[PDB]
RNA sequence: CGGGAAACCAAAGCUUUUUGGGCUCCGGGGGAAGUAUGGUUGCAAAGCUGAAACUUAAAGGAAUUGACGGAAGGGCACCACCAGGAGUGGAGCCUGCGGCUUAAUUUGACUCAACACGGGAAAACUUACCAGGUCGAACAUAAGUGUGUAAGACAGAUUGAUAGCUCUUUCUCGAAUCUAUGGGUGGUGGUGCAUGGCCGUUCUUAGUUCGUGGAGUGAUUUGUCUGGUUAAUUCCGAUAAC
RNA sequence: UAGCAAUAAUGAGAUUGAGCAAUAACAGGUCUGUGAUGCCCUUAGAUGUCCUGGGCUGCACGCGCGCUACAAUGAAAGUAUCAACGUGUAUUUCCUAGACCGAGAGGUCCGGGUAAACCGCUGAACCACUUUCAUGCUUGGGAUUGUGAACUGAAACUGUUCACGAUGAACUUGGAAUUCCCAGUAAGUGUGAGUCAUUAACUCGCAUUGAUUACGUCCCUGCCCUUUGUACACACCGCCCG
């Protein structure tokens, strides 16, 4: 999870884009849940262009 | 193994792409500072071997409430006299491990070592006896008889064989259970190897080439040009 | 037993059997005059649209057909 | 060119690379305790000497970040006041919640951030509740002469109702599933202290992460500023990067 | 380098209200939003699925948001007359026109609108005028309560709602305390929509009437910024002494 989702974060860097965050979330069975968040890029969040920009699933 | 190679952005890491100077004693001889990191992998790194010593977590209270930073201890070295330590902390582990290892390519000092009584086949352990301070912790260092393998804890056990010397014995005061602080006490007598008055340099010398002034006005040009 | 959330044991305590049926030895003794003269045995409908060959047997005289499993109840007086 | 853990200090430095001018006093984890006891001094109060039993995995020093409170400073807000106005707290009823009550008052939420919530204005349904009361669901996937493995539906009975729910009387089910289940598919059953997602406040705000850097032994640290500037990390600036 | 006294100038000092909303997290809420879900649990003796009814509406009491009023600026019967946001039937069960039959609730028979077309100039409600009550706990107020007339739901009771006559409770403005707000705002008054077979005092909208009083400070209670103390760091709901 800190690796083989670290790959694929600069495997689509390479089409141009302008930044990308990961969040995953959940237990590492220590069951007190945590979340890490997997930062590269200049992200918006707000405004306009949260609803134009940015996609997310 | 570029793969991708390098612009100099400093002034002689050009001379190194340039091929102005084959010898990184010639950066050591006028002591002026290795700057950007891809200058020694040039003049070393085939196989040159490092070890990660020590990566215990570091915290900082804030309101909402602890956040960590994963300080790394890294150690690299020539086994023909040169040492690095890295010290760098990060977010998360891996690059900590990776940020301090151009910190550890960054402070790569030589190593003196020589002979005790005997001039006799390939200069072995230390010219003297030397010590060095950073925080409570002093380690001497003893020059130790041919053949009298390495006396001291683990933690300089790993780091003078780094060090391209044959045997040590060393006597460490201070509280030496602080991992990284142990580490970095030792590298205070090695700079000081080359740093003691032995009678074997009290001739005058060459005075130098001043490489500056040597290679001057083949840097009037503006460009970065290589071989 | 079985355990619910809040409350247990309300207590009828719950022997569920839907039909016994470890009776009911059926009647496949038919009667069959002689060869080629037949009897129905335990009157089934005297219409027979429906297959109904079920064999009912000797209630207090209020017959019932199985096929159709309690309609058309058959002896009998019936109504006009 | 010092030193130290630092705070810091022309000594607290010259305690090199276990160092060395000379002399004297004192300490050896924390307590029990400057107690007990003996001796000595004293008019007394008390002073100078001074243990152990037992107990203990820490006590402590200098610094760092938060905590941001009879800590001063500089600022902000109608979920804060001043100045106003309107309502609640009075009564009536509606509804929520507590309590009691009963078989259930299903139940989930308790300062803001629970309480006319769950978009829950509930006649059944919803509903998970209660009381009777049916009906088959998937890894023991079945050993067993289908004379039953699981229901549709007569009168007497029964039930909420001939409901064959069940039974007297007794036919009828279609192994195209009772497996006599591994403590299970399902389940509005358990735990949101296992969790995902969702949101909630945190938080009326202005805050936050950097890559390299002149800055610490180090946690960390002008970078993210004393402006005498703005809803605002907002700025002609001191500038100590961009 | 900020003579922000240029109110001017101007439909406009923004129409100015809103949607999105970082870093950091909480043991915030939800397993009873779901075929998001671990494990647990029980299912031939079902928690499921429901078969029927009851309950969630049980009431000596505490507490919460509200509705209606405590009237003569009003109340009462008439008479004048203006909305806006929008919703509107297709195994149809909706918006509704125009006749008929009804004290009314509601009944018959036909018509329009799948919608800027029809309701619909959405020609709503206080406010406007005239009379009746004279400020009597009275026709203020409508709690309570008997009987009839009805409606939808197969089916209506500490109730499913709706009118007609009758009853006319408390309340004469609400202690300590405590809310919301600086302009088309508060507050008054309606209407649409939500769930809806039927039932809104609820919330999501919308129009209408349209003031007072600031035009600001840090007292109150919070939130930021640093400087500063700390023996706190499950963090002052701390730690902690006899």
């Given at each position: 999870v800190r690796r083989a989702c670290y790959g694929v974060?600069?495997?689509?860097?390479?089409?141009?884009?302008?930044?990308?965050?990961?969040?995953?979330?959940?237990?590492?069975?220590?069951?007190?849940?945590?979340?890490?968040?997997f930062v590269d890029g200049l992200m918006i969040h707000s405004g306009?262009?949260?609803?134009?920009?940015?996609?997310?699933? | 193994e570029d793969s991708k190679e390098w612009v100099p952005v400093t002034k002689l890491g050009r001379l190194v792409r340039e091929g102005k100077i084959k010898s990184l004693e010639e950066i050591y001889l006028y002591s002026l500072?290795?700057?950007?990191?891809?200058?020694?992998?040039?003049?070393?790194?085939?196989?040159?071997?490092?070890?990660?010593?020590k990566i215990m977590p570091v915290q900082k209270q804030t309101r909402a409430g602890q956040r960590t930073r994963f300080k790394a201890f890294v150690a690299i070295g020539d086994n023909n006299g040169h040492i690095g330590l890295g010290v760098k902390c990060s977010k998360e582990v891996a690059t900590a491990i990776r940020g301090?290892?151009?910190?550890?390519?960054?402070?790569?000092?030589?190593?003196?070592?020589?002979?005790?009584?005997?001039?006799?086949?390939?200069?072995?352990?230390?010219?003297?006896?030397?010590?060095?301070?950073?925080g409570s912790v002093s380690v001497r260092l003893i020059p130790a008889p041919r053949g009298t393998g390495i006396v001291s804890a683990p933690v300089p056990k790993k780091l003078l064989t780094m060090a391209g010397i044959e045997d040590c014995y060393t006597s460490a005061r201070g509280s030496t259970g602080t991992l990284g602080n142990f580490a970095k006490a030792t590298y205070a007598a090695i700079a000081?190897?080359?740093?003691?008055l032995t009678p074997d340099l009290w001739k005058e010398m060459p005075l130098?080439?001043?490489?500056?002034?040597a290679y001057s006005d083949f840097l009037s040009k503006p460009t970065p040009r290589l071989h | 037993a079985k355990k619910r959330k809040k409350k247990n044991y309300s207590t009828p305590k719950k022997i569920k059997?839907?039909?016994?049926?470890?009776?009911?030895?059926?009647?496949?003794?038919?009667?069959?005059?002689?060869?080629?003269?037949?009897?129905?045995?335990?009157?089934?409908?005297?219409?027979?649209?429906?297959?109904?060959?079920?064999?009912?047997?000797?209630?207090?005289?209020?017959?019932?057909?199985?096929?159709?499993?309690?309609?058309?109840?058959?002896?009998?007086?019936?109504?006009?």
């Open positions: 974060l600069r495997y689509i860097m390479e089409s141009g884009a302008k930044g990308c965050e990961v969040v995953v979330s959940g237990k590492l069975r220590g069951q007190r849940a945590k979340s890490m968040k306009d262009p949260c609803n134009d920009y940015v996609e997310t699933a | 500072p290795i700057k950007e990191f891809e200058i020694i992998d040039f003049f070393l790194g085939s196989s040159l071997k490092d070890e990660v010593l301090a290892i151009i910190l550890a390519k960054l402070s790569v000092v030589p190593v003196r070592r020589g002979y005790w009584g005997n001039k006799i086949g390939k200069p072995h352990t230390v010219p003297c006896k030397v010590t060095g301070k950073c000081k190897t080359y740093a003691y130098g080439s001043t490489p500056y002034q | 059997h839907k039909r016994k049926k470890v009776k009911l030895a059926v009647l496949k003794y038919y009667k069959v005059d002689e060869n080629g003269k037949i009897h129905r045995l335990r009157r089934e409908c005297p219409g027979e649209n429906c297959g109904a060959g079920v064999f009912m047997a000797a209630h207090e005289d209020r017959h019932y057909c199985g096929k159709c499993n309690l309609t058309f109840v058959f002896s009998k007086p019936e109504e006009k």
